[PDB]
Structure formats: C-alpha cells, structure tokens
Amino acid sequence: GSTADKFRFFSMARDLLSWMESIIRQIETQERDVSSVELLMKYHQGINAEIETRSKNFSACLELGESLLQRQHQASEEIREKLQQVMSRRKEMNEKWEARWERLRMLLEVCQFSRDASVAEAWLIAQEPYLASGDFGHTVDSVEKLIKRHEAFEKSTASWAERFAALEKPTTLELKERQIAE
Amino acid sequence: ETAEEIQERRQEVLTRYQSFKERVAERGQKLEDSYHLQVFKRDADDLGKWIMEKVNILTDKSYEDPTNIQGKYQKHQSLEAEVQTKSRLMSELEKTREERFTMGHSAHEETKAHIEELRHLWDLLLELTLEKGDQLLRAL
C-alpha cells in the first residue's frame, strides 16, 4: 500500500494545486469595477461555494499526507513540502477571496451612495418652480391658501431628512484611511 | 469615482441642501409676514367701515320720524357705549402696530399709515357723537 498511498497522495495534491491556481486566477481575472449594480456579488460568492465542495478533498489529501509522514515513509521530505505547498496555497486562496470580498462591500457603497446623490440632486431641481415664486398673497384668503400649500410642501420636504441624513455618515473607503493616514 | 478620497467634493456639491433649507425657511417666514400684514389691514379697514357706519347714522339728520327725547337720549347713550367698547379695538391695533411692525419692518410706514387714517376717522366720530349728544342734553 505504501507506493499506492504515496502515489495517490501526490495525485490529490497536484489536482488541488491545479484547481487552486484556477480559482486564484478566477478571483483576479474579474477586473481591478461593476458599472452600477454588481452581479459580481453572485459571481464572487459562487466561487466560495465551489471552494466548500473541495473541503473534503483537502481533509483527505491532508490526512493521507499526515499519516504517511507519521509512518516513517522515506519520501517524507518531498511529502512534507507538498503538503505545506497545498496548505500555503489554501490560506493564500481564502485570503485572496476574503481580501476581495471586503472590497466588493466597499465598491457597493459608492455605487449606492453615488446613485443616492444624483436622485437627491435631481429632486431639489424639481422643487424650483414652486420655490421660485414671488406670490405672497394680496388678501387674507390668498395668503392663508399659500401658507397651507407651504405647510403641505414642507411636510413632504421633511420626509427626505433621513435620505439626506444617510449621506452624512462616512464610508468604509474613507474609514480605512485611518490605517493609511495614521 | 474620481480621486476617491477626493470624491467627497460631491458631498460639498450636497450643500445645495443647506441653500434649499434656508430658502424654505425664508418663504415660510415671508408668508408669515404677509399673513400678519393682511390680517392687520383688513381689521383696520373694517374698523374704518364701522366708524363710517356710525358717522352716517349720526349725520342722517335727514331724518327718520322719531321725536321722544328722553328715549333719543337712551339710543344715544347706548351708542356711546358701543364706541367705548369698540375703542378697545383701536388700542389693540395701535399696540399691534407698535409691537409687531417695528423699526426694521417693511410695513412700518404702511401699517403706521392705516393707524393714522383711523385716528383721523376716530376724531370725526368723537366730534359728531359729542355734538349730537350735546343737543339732546340741552333738549332734556
């Protein structure tokens, strides 16, 4: 079983090493960058799903490797290194996935925030006609009507207080600066 | 998405909102100013009308029939009361003008003018009621 076992171990490692390089390249390939709304959320997570599927394989590969090393197989050195190599490329894979995932949330802010702004900016342009008038009444009745119209107007204005209030609080982009700034 | 730390210039492009809020506050304020002014004007004008109605009754010497003097004196006494109680409205308007349309108000001269027109009308009423009154006193 030794030669079969050894042979099988290296067969698994190789397969996992090839698959990782493929996935690591899969991460970097997509560009840095969605226009507005990111299907990249679905696309990037899908990758994680595939990673989970391999979970067993690693355990298998890793275990065999360990058992082989315990039993004083005399390819131990070659074995040790290949299993470091697979373990190294594993942590590196999840670091490079999570590394990016944080950023997917980061770009999420600008796309959302940017849109949030244009919508607000647009709405303020819209109110101009009303807010431009020089009519203030020439009669108790007329002014009473204008005040009530204004009362209605202000209330609807009031609604947006939250919407604008959200744009006040800063971004993770801008937050991270603390680490770059300090 | 330009100079992403610099992006927040878009935030300063938000200041529109500050200019928007201020203009809302200004319109409301101006509407309030107009309200108080119009309300005043109407009350003043109405007081004017009221005075003239009395004045017309007093000068309608061109007459009805009536000749009972003691009673005539009662209708007259009752008229002086109406004037007295209404006099309170004159005071309130003067007070309102002094307090709500002070130096630093657009309608200072305009609201001072109305109160002046009424002071003049008021004098007229007083002269006429005093004169009609005096006749009756003399006629018993």
Swiss-Prot record, chain A:
Task: Report the domain of life of the source organism.
Answer: Eukaryota
Cite the effect that the entry attributes to S118P. In EL3; Providence
**Resulting phenotype, L124R:** In EL3; Buffalo
Which residues are recorded as modified (Phosphothreonine)? T172
Spectrin repeat segments = 7-105, 112-174
Name the residue ranges with Basic and acidic residues bias.
174-182
Localization, per the record, is: Cytoplasm, Cytoskeleton; Cytoplasm, Cell cortex
> What does UniProt say on post-translational modification here?
(Microbial infection) Probably cleaved by P.falciparum SERA6; the cleavage results in SPTB solubilization causing the disruption of the actin cytoskeleton and the rupture of the erythrocyte cell membrane releasing the merozoites.
Modified sites of kind Phosphoserine = S142
Outcome of mutating A117G, per the record?
Answer: In EL3; Cagliary
Q: How does it assemble?
A: Composed of nonhomologous chains, alpha and beta, which aggregate to form dimers, tetramers, and higher polymers. Interacts with BCAM.
Instruction: Look up the record and name the associated disease.
Output: Elliptocytosis 3: A Rhesus-unlinked form of hereditary elliptocytosis, a genetically heterogeneous hematologic disorder characterized by variable hemolytic anemia and elliptical or oval red cell shape. Inheritance can be autosomal dominant or autosomal recessive. Spherocytosis 2: An autosomal dominant form of hereditary spherocytosis, a group of hematologic disorders characterized by numerous abnormally shaped erythrocytes which are generally spheroidal. Clinical manifestations include chronic hemolytic anemia, jaundice, and splenomegaly, with variable severity.
Q: What else does the entry mention about this protein?
A: This complex is anchored to the cytoplasmic face of the plasma membrane via another protein, ankyrin, which binds to beta-spectrin and mediates the binding of the whole complex to a transmembrane protein band 3. The interaction of erythrocyte spectrin with other proteins through specific binding domains lead to the formation of an extensive subplasmalemmal meshwork which is thought to be responsible for the maintenance of the biconcave shape of human erythrocytes, for the regulation of plasma membrane components and for the maintenance of the lipid asymmetry of the plasma membrane.
Q: Which family does it belong to?
A: Belongs to the spectrin family.
Functional note: Spectrin is the major constituent of the cytoskeletal network underlying the erythrocyte plasma membrane. It associates with band 4.1 and actin to form the cytoskeletal superstructure of the erythrocyte plasma membrane.
- Protein name as it appears in the record: Spectrin beta chain, erythrocytic
Species this protein is from: Homo sapiens (Human)
Q: Which gene encodes it?
A: SPTB
First and last residue shown, out of the full length, are 1902 to 2083 of 2137
From Swiss-Prot, chain B:
* Result for mutant: R23W: In EL2; Tunis
Highest taxon of source: Eukaryota
State how changing R27S affects the protein, per the record: In EL2; Clichy
Report each Spectrin repeat as a residue range: 35-137
Mutation effect (V13A): In EL2; Marseille
Where found in the cell? Cytoplasm, Cytoskeleton; Cytoplasm, Cell cortex
Q: Where are the transmembrane segments?
A: none
Describe the disease involvement stated in the record for this chain. Answer: Elliptocytosis 2: A Rhesus-unlinked form of hereditary elliptocytosis, a genetically heterogeneous, autosomal dominant hematologic disorder. It is characterized by variable hemolytic anemia and elliptical or oval red cell shape. Hereditary pyropoikilocytosis: Autosomal recessive hematologic disorder characterized by hemolytic anemia, microspherocytosis, poikilocytosis, and an unusual thermal sensitivity of red cells.
Miscellaneous section: This complex is anchored to the cytoplasmic face of the plasma membrane via another protein, ankyrin, which binds to beta-spectrin and mediates the binding of the whole complex to a transmembrane protein band 3. The interaction of erythrocyte spectrin with other proteins through specific binding domains lead to the formation of an extensive subplasmalemmal meshwork which is thought to be responsible for the maintenance of the biconcave shape of human erythrocytes, for the regulation of plasma membrane components and for the maintenance of the lipid asymmetry of the plasma membrane.
Self-association or partners: how does it assemble? Answer: Composed of non-homologous chains, alpha and beta, which aggregate side-to-side in an antiparallel fashion to form dimers, tetramers, and higher polymers. Interacts with FASLG. Interacts with BCAM.
Function as written in the Swiss-Prot or TrEMBL entry:
Spectrin is the major constituent of the cytoskeletal network underlying the erythrocyte plasma membrane. It associates with band 4.1 and actin to form the cytoskeletal superstructure of the erythrocyte plasma membrane.
Q: Which family does it belong to?
A: Belongs to the spectrin family.
Record protein name field: Spectrin alpha chain, erythrocytic 1
Which residues of the parent protein does this chain contain? Answer: 19 to 158 of 2419
